[PDB]
Amino acid sequence: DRILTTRNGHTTSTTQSSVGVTYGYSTQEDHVSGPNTSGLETRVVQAERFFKKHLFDWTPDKAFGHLEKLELPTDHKGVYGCLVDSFAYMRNGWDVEVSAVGNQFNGGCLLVAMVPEWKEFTPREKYQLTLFPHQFISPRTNMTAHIVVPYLGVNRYDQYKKHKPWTLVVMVVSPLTTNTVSAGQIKVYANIAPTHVHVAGELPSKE
């Protein structure tokens, strides 16, 4: 019933504490082949798979508004990372999964959102982050958020070393509460996987 199993490549993630999958803005991808690539683009499926990253430790001291961010893509030491150094242009979506594991005795709430064209938000703007593809994480209800977003931006293809369209954001909505039965803190991890990965301008070898 409430048990979801996500699979990207030869990697899977089975979440029992899931609310569902939120698809941001659209469920389809703008044609990966446009006039800016002159039909010289290709798809690299070997890169469409999960990679992990620890975001932060959610503690009782962090109040409302505490915000942590992770601009994508980040340094990747795998196949995807190899692509970034071998090609001038790339484009891809993101299958994001964020988990804050504690126990049913913890209280509190986290907002998990994917933001296009990140900009530092002011205290007041934070009250409206729900305008972006998001999902909440509350111990009593779920320990895993799951968001899926497509590629976008002014350009059909991008140079990730100069611009990062999507930015993962996690913000404390209501501080973590603890009992004598609860967990003391909750470590928030991210399980991310790039989607519909396409490369275009093959670069020379650096030697």
Binding site: I3, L4, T5
Partner: peptide, 6 residues
């Protein structure tokens, strides 16, 4: 068991 998002 449950749903799949392959």
């Amino acid at each position: 068991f449950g749903a799949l998002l392959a």
